[PDB]
């Protein structure tokens, strides 16, 4: 069980989650401190964490999109 976008595992998709995905892309971190952070970060569902996952999370937080591409059925 996890929420897409919730890369810190705190139960909420927030601005900082997209910062954490950017830290991974930058190489500042090599893993997420949440057991499900890798799967939560991959919001386009393509199998890799990339910069557009971070901007998708930010854009969800800001209200541009209301679901992630991995959730579209």
């Amino acid at each position: 069980k996890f929420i897409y976008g919730d890369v810190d595992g705190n139960g909420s998709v927030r601005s900082i989650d997209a910062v954490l995905i950017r830290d991974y892309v930058l190489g500042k971190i090599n893993e997420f401190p949440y057991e499900y952070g890798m799967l939560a970060a991959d919001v386009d569902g393509n199998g890799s964490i990339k910069i557009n996952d971070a901007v998708l999370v930010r854009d969800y937080v800001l209200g541009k999109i209301f679901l992630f591409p991995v959730e579209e059925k």
């Binding site: 950017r22 830290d23 892309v25 930058l26 190489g27 500042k28 386009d44 990339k50 910069i51 557009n52 971070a54 901007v55 998708l56 930010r58 854009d59 800001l62 541009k64 999109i65 591409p69």
Partner: protein
């Protein structure tokens, strides 16, 4: 197609040299998000600083990180959600200022390489630019000034 160029340069042992990262044939519709990572041999050069270039109109959109033990430098651009800033013209994206090791010998060549595993370019949050070309740079260690 979009072309990313890592410039080549030269300098003395002990010097700071600058390597520009240039984008050519940028799509006029705009690059919304990108990451760009360069590797280097960390016992030959190390990063002193990274400076955003003229393509960055607002620092909020540009983030950098480097690790001088592991030999990489990473840059990201995220346009704001309204596309109020966007990269849609050609020019310098960033410049990496590298310290050349004081033990470098004249004639050594340091490859500053684009990392395709960590470099990607997007027209929007879901639409990737999937035909970008890269042209890597070299730093040559020289004996004389300039």
């Amino acid at each position: 197609m979009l072309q990313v160029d890592i410039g080549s340069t030269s300098g003395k042992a002990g010097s700071v040299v600058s390597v520009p990262i240039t984008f050519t044939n940028v799509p006029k519709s705009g690059i919304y998000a990108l990451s760009f990572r360069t590797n280097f041999d960390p016992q030959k050069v190390t990063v002193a600083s990274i400076d955003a270039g003229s393509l960055i109109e607002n620092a909020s959109d540009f983030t950098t990180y480097y690790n001088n033990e592991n030999g990489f430098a990473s840059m990201t651009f995220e346009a704001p959600v309204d596309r109020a800033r966007i990269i849609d013209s050609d020019g310098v994206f960033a410049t990496i200022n590298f310290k050349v090791s004081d033990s470098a010998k004249v004639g050594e060549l340091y490859n500053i390489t684009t990392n395709s595993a960590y470099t990607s370019f997007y027209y929007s949050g879901t639409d990737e630019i999937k035909n970008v070309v890269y042209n890597d740079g070299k730093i040559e260690v020289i004996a004389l000034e300039h």
